[PDB]
Amino acid sequence: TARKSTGGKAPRKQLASY
Amino acid sequence: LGIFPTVEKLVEEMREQLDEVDSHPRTSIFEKLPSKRDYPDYFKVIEKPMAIDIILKNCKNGTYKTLEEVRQALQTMFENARFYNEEGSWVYVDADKLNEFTDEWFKEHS
């Protein structure tokens, strides 16, 4: 899959409560 | 130099695995750990951080002396990517594609 334009990661939403 | 020459060649082969659309090396995101500034929770969420630069350094400094250690470090690195990132995201896909490549590499070298 093409790299995200910023080069940034894709952190899962559920980790906000980890 | 221990296993460092063998690992340097493996990493070069990994870096030659490019995305079919934009040609980015699938190793790109794995070369170094995320910045704590950009991802403040990364080091809270990921218990055993790992990246390619760390793997190479550990083969140079004698921390990893066996391919088994390198295989476990790569497995952890890819598991960290799959745990942290959304399924189907570019990082997740690169982790899966590279992990399939390294699985075959280890088979051929075992």
Numbering used by the authors:
A (entry chain B): 6 to 23
B (entry chain A): 1249 to 1358
Paste lines from the article.
There are 15 bromodomains in S. cerevisiae, and we purified four of these bromodomains and characterized their binding abilities with H3K14bz and H3K27bz peptides. Although most bromodomains showed negligible H3K14bz or H3K27bz binding abilities, the Bromodomain from Sth1 (Sth1BD), the ATPase subunit in the Remodel the Structure of Chromatin (RSC) complex, surprisingly exhibited robust interaction with H3K14bz (Kd = 89 μM), albeit weaker than that with H3K14ac (Kd = 16 μM)36 Fig. 6 Sth1 bromodomain has Kbz binding activity. To reveal how Sth1BD recognizes Kbz, we determined the crystal structure of Sth1BD in the complex with the H3K14bz peptide at a resolution of 1.4 Å. The H3 peptide is well ordered, as evidenced by good electron density from T6 to Y23. Histone H3 sits on the acidic apical region of the Sth1BD helical bundle and makes extensive contacts with the ZA-loop, BC-loop, αZ′, αA′, αB, and αC of Sth1BD. The overall complex conformation is highly similar to that of Sth1BD-H3K14ac, except for the shift of the H3 C-terminal 310-helix (K18-A21). The indistinguishable configurations of the Kbz- and Kac-binding pockets indicate that the acylation-binding pocket of Sth1BD intrinsically has adequate space to accommodate the large benzene ring without any structural rearrangement. The Sth1BD-H3K14bz structure clearly shows that the acylation-binding pocket of Sth1 has adequate space to accommodate the large benzene ring without any structural rearrangement of Sth1BD. This indicates that although most bromodomains have small acyl-binding pockets suitable for short acetyl marks, certain bromodomains can bind diverse acylation marks other than acetylation.
Lysine benzoylation (Kbz) is a recently discovered post-translational modification associated with active transcription. Here, we systematically characterize writer, eraser, and reader proteins of histone Kbz in S. cerevisiae using proteomic, biochemical, and structural approaches. The Spt-Ada-Gcn5 acetyltransferase (SAGA) complex and NAD+-dependent histone deacetylase Hst2 could function as the writer and eraser of histone Kbz, respectively. In addition, we demonstrate that a subset of YEATS domains and bromodomains serve as Kbz readers, and structural analyses reveal how YEATS and bromodomains recognize Kbz marks.
